[PDB]
Amino acid sequence: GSSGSSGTSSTIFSGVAIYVNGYTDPSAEELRKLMMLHGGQYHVYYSRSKTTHIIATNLPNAKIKELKGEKVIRPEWIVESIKAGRLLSYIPYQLYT
């Protein structure tokens, strides 16, 4: 099973699982598809094995304690990368690093 012309053949997000937590822009639903369409993976629940990164805009002092070590990138790192059509950097997109 396969389609003729998918649209934008780009594997800039190959094997890249993301997990939106809390309020984010765009919304989680948006990033949910943008991923699959860009060869990405979406997880409803937070996984330490499946999910590779943690998408989020802001986290409470408490949460920052439960995510001491992981890489929380802003929801803008993907949006921008898509709009440009190429994978961008994440360093500057790291909230608490």
Curated annotation (Swiss-Prot):
It comes from the Eukaryota. Ubiquitous. Residues 8-95 form the BRCT domain. Coiled coil: none annotated. Transmembrane segments: none annotated. It is found in: Nucleus. Deoxycytidyl transferase involved in DNA repair. Transfers a dCMP residue from dCTP to the 3'-end of a DNA primer in a template-dependent reaction. May assist in the first step in the bypass of abasic lesions by the insertion of a nucleotide opposite the lesion. Required for normal induction of mutations by physical and chemical agents. The C-terminal domain is necessary for protein interactions. Monomer. Interacts with the DNA polymerase zeta which is composed of REV3L and MAD2L2; the interaction with MAD2L2 is direct and requires that REV3L is in its closed conformation. Interacts with POLH, POLI and POLK. May bind ITGA3. Interacts with FAAP20/C1orf86. Belongs to the DNA polymerase type-Y family. This is DNA repair protein REV1.
